[PDB]
Amino acid sequence: NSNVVTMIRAGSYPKVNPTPTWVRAIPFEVSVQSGIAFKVPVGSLFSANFRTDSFTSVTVMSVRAWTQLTPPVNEYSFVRLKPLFKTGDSTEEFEGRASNINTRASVGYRIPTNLRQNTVAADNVCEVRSNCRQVALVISCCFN
Amino acid sequence: SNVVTMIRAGSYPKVNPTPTWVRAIPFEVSVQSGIAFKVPVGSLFSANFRTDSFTSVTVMSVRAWTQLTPPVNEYSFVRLKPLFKTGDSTEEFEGRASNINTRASVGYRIPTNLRQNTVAADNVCEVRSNCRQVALVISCCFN
Amino acid sequence: DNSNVVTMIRAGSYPKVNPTPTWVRAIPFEVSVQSGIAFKVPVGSLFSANFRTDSFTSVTVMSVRAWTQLTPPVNEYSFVRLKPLFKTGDSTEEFEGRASNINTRASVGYRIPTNLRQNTVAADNVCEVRSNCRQVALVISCCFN
Amino acid sequence: NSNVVTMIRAGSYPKVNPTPTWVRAIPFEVSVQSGIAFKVPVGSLFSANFRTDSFTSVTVMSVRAWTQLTPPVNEYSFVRLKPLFKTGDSTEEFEGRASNINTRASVGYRIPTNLRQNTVAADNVCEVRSNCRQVALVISCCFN
Amino acid sequence: NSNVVTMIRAGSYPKVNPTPTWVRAIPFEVSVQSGIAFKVPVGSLFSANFRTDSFTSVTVMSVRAWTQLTPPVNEYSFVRLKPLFKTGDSTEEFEGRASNINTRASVGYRIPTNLRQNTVAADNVCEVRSNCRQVALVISCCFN
Amino acid sequence: NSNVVTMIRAGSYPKVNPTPTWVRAIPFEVSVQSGIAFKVPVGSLFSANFRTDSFTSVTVMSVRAWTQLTPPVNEYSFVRLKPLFKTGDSTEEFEGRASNINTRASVGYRIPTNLRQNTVAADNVCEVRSNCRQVALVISCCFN
Amino acid sequence: NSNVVTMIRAGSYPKVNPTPTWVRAIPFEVSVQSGIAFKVPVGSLFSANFRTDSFTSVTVMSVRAWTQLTPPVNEYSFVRLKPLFKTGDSTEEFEGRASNINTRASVGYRIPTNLRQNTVAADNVCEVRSNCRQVALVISCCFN
Amino acid sequence: EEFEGRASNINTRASVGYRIPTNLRQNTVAADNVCEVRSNCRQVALVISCCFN
RNA sequence: AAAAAA
RNA sequence: AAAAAAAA
RNA sequence: UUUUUU
RNA sequence: UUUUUUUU
RNA sequence: AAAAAAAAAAA
RNA sequence: UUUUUU
RNA sequence: AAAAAAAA
RNA sequence: AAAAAAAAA
RNA sequence: AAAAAAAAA
RNA sequence: UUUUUUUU
RNA sequence: AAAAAAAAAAA
RNA sequence: UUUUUUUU
RNA sequence: UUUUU
RNA sequence: UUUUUU
Numbered sequence A, D, E, F, G: 001n002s003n004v005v006t007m008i009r010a011g012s013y014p015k016v017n018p019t020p021t022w023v024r025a026i027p028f029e030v031s032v033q034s035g036i037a038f039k040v041p042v043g044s045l046f047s048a049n050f051r052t053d054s055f056t057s058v059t060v061m062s063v064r065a066w067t068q069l070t071p072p073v074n075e076y077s078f079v080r081l082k083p084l085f086k087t088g089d090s091t092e093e094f095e096g097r098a099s100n101i102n103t104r105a106s107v108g109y110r111i112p113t114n115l116r117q118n119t120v121a122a123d124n125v126c127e128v129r130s131n132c133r134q135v136a137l138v139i140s141c142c143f144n
Numbered sequence B: 001s002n003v004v005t006m007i008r009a010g011s012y013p014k015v016n017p018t019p020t021w022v023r024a025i026p027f028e029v030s031v032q033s034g035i036a037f038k039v040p041v042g043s044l045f046s047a048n049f050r051t052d053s054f055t056s057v058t059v060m061s062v063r064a065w066t067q068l069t070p071p072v073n074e075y076s077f078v079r080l081k082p083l084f085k086t087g088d089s090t091e092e093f094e095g096r097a098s099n100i101n102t103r104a105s106v107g108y109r110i111p112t113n114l115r116q117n118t119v120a121a122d123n124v125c126e127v128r129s130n131c132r133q134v135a136l137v138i139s140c141c142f143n
Numbered sequence C: 001d002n003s004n005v006v007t008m009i010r011a012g013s014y015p016k017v018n019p020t021p022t023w024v025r026a027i028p029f030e031v032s033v034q035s036g037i038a039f040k041v042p043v044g045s046l047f048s049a050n051f052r053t054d055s056f057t058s059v060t061v062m063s064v065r066a067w068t069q070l071t072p073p074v075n076e077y078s079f080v081r082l083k084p085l086f087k088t089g090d091s092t093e094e095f096e097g098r099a100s101n102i103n104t105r106a107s108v109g110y111r112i113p114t115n116l117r118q119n120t121v122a123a124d125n126v127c128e129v130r131s132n133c134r135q136v137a138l139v140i141s142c143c144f145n
Numbered sequence H: 001e002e003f004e005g006r007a008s009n010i011n012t013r014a015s016v017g018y019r020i021p022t023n024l025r026q027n028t029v030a031a032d033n034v035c036e037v038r039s040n041c042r043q044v045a046l047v048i049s050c051c052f053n
Numbered sequence I: 001a002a003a004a005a006a
Numbered sequence J, O: 001a002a003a004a005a006a007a008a
Numbered sequence K, N, V: 001u002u003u004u005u006u
Numbered sequence L, R, T: 001u002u003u004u005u006u007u008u
Numbered sequence M, S: 001a002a003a004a005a006a007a008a009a010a011a
Numbered sequence P, Q: 001a002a003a004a005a006a007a008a009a
Numbered sequence U: 001u002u003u004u005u
């Protein structure tokens, strides 16, 4: 309600951290080929395009996908996700298909707490299969 | 009361022949592929909106829709980057379509602490889209 | 706290829009008057860039109020009459208000019933004004459309 | 109660009006022929027989009609009313018939608020049709 | 509500009255000479400027007076009222004075129910006195 | 309920009206050119196609308009409306745009009670603009 | 209750019907001979005088009859109604007599919902008998 | 905007004021200007509720 | 609460 | 209690 | 209680 | 309350 | 027990 | 409440 | 909540 | 009914 | 989303 | 609600 | 809260 | 039992 | 109440 | 309830 500056009765110097962690929802795309699985690299989350180039590690919480280009002729779009982990890759293929040809396909998977460790740029996140030549992704992750 | 009735008016009131006006102004802009276009504040001053008599305006929010179809195989999309005289933003508020035949849409609100006047020479925001036009509806206050 | 930065709006379908909306206003303007002579106030005085209304061509008047704008003749108390005029039939009322102090304005006004609130164009007239003061200040509450 | 004059403590000069408005029901008769409609002119309402000769406009609210003379032999009286408006005449025929030959026939119609604009002497109110030679009208209106 | 005409199921022809009564506040002025009383004539109430030229009798209820022009130099406005009755004039002088030389003087008097009989043009209502050359009155009356 | 005809103890002859009013929603289409407004005629409402050829006037209440044909390539349908009145034309351009190129565009406007007078065939309702060569109208009105 | 037009945010194209049904009370008169029964044809309900010339069928609910002309000398008016149906004519003679020679004779009958089918112009509704040469009818029906 | 106030008594002052919303309450230096004033009287008295800092 | 219909 | 005729 | 409007 | 119906 | 009828001049 | 009456 | 300037 | 601005008016 | 901001009674 | 105080 | 005094013209 | 940036 | 959530 | 007064 004050229109003017005021005096803060500051005390002892507080605990500081010039490089906190930040929880994010990173949107990026990946080019997919027909019948070929594409390994999504973690390194794609580290970029000045997301303000995250200052990080080297990230704990992924959940992954969501969307077909980014139209599907072949006569077909309905589809996208699949196989979760990948350093301690052991999964064989799940969380799939989603569009019920309208003109509409995107989508799917996502959540990572359980016991599997939410850090990952670096060299590591992979999951395999993406699709009949569309491009898939949009949105990863909910904790940079640190 | 089906007939005129007398009014017991009193002293002469405080008057103002040129008041303010809260408005939602719809106008379109042309956008080029892979290029950002600065939305000029001047577009809000026009006889088409009854706002030619104004020279300044306080923008409150900005919403955007793609106005033409997207490139073949692509889904529409539109981004908005707020711009201020005291410092431009780097936010890219993006919305995308989920049906190729449908518009993409997104918008942003200006916080009270940044709601200062802007004149015709100023710019509201940068617009990016894969669509050759974008329809903007800006909720603002003319003064 | 309130927001200190820009925030995203999860807009959706393109809304119904209107670039030339209506506007409810209270317009102030004066009219010169002559002694013992009425003056038909033109509706075209409400349309003007001095009121931001030059873009309108019709208007619905709701009420009319009037104040003498200049002093009265020597030894006289100000006064002002209003006779409503309507295209379907002018009125014969003479709503009159007088001043009780020579140095003070005279005032009066009238309300238009809902059934008589149709559009009026510049060529039309609102009401006649009589007064011993040479100029009268009007404040008209009207809906431009 | 008071039996003598008493001093009123008047103050400022009030808002006055020498020519005020008036709500009225005007009784008058119109002359009607067989099979021929008669347009009731609004000018019939302004007259020193009603104290209304000082008005040039009037807002009609409702119209009531009664036959005024005996019907043709072997017939029961009747009367019709077709509202007329400067913005567009109406085609209704609000009719009323007597159930006794010796009794008047009556009918009427109300004008809705959205159609209650002024009218001048040169205007018409409604068409009257009857098998009686004369008709009696009572028009509720607000002179101004 | 209603946007179109609607029928009225009228019955027998009602009692009517084309020349009814009217309760009014009639504003008018009178010229007054210094030191001389002016008998206000009832005829002033009958006039087409008031819509009452169709009446020939009136019952007065109350009379209020205001000075219409400025007072003499150095003096505060004043005005008196002496009621007059055909049955017997009264010797009251209901006097109101102004407290600002620039402001009107005002006063009035009420007529008791027992002294509320008609009056005709030839009659008078009251004597007015004032140091101002004109007096504006507002008489509340029932024309009949 | 009853399986056979029953007697009605009818009384005096009632009030009747062989030509009553009628509240309707009238659908019709108009041709519109590119960049050119089209004044929609009130006469379109009177017609044997709507059972309203017996009416000569109509009190319009609201207007709703949809695009009837596809829009130009790459564009989304739109339709504007400018209310027109005999007492004064409006400058409002109530617009409605589609968000799916395959979907109609729609918009309407309500007429306020104080503007719900009648209109005749000669009169016009509103100006229609659109990028589609044909517009569908649905006018909620009261025929009288 | 505004004072000026507002925008309606219309939606999809609604279901429409340019030629809806109509519930009506159609008044008309039928000429009758003494001692002879007159069949009332249904086609009399279709006519531009009733705004129904666009209907080819109708469902009749009730019938009411009033003698339209005076009776013979020394007699009291009367009227008889005999319902007629395509699936089988009735033999009821619903009758009503005046208790005052100068007063109409009235009677009507209700059609039960199991016998409320459509009737075309060539069909007949009921036979009429009376000692008056004409008879006024008011039929409550549903035009479709 | 032209917030205007007139007097109903010739011998009386004419008055009018305007409030500045929160989103437009920033600092102003000497060179700057507050508002334009138009009056038929040759002088005008101002009372400005401000916050020096 | 609007119009037509015991 | 619905339907029919009657019925203070 | 029904039908158009809503 | 004369004639008909109404899930046993 | 919020404990009888008014009007005229001065609170 | 003072005070002048039916 | 007392005091100061402001303040519907 | 979580992290990164604050843990006390 | 069911209360408020601007102009008006 | 801008500047001061008020028993820890 | 069954939420202030009447009369004149039109319900 | 204050609220504000970003999170499925 | 018009405009704007 | 509309509306015209003390």
Ligand SMILES: [Cl-]
Residues within 6 Å of the ligand: A100, A102, B099, B101, F102
């Ligand atoms: Cl589709």
Ligand SMILES: [Cl-]
Residues within 6 Å of the ligand: A102, B101, F102
């Ligand atoms: Cl398609």
Ligand SMILES: [Cl-]
Residues within 6 Å of the ligand: C103, E102, H011
């Ligand atoms: Cl003074």
Ligand SMILES: [Cl-]
Residues within 6 Å of the ligand: C040, C085, C125
């Ligand atoms: Cl004129």
Ligand SMILES: [Cl-]
Residues within 6 Å of the ligand: E001, E002, E003, E004, F023, F142, I002, I003
């Ligand atoms: Cl209606």
Ligand SMILES: [Mg+2]
Residues within 6 Å of the ligand: A067, A068, A069, A070, A071, A077, A098, A102, A103, A104, A105, A132
């Ligand atoms: Mg797809």
Ligand SMILES: [Mg+2]
Residues within 6 Å of the ligand: D067, D068, D069, D070, D071, D077, D078, D102, D103, D104, D105, D132
């Ligand atoms: Mg008769």
Ligand SMILES: [Mg+2]
Residues within 6 Å of the ligand: G067, G068, G069, G070, G071, G077, G078, G103, G104, G105, G132
């Ligand atoms: Mg008979």
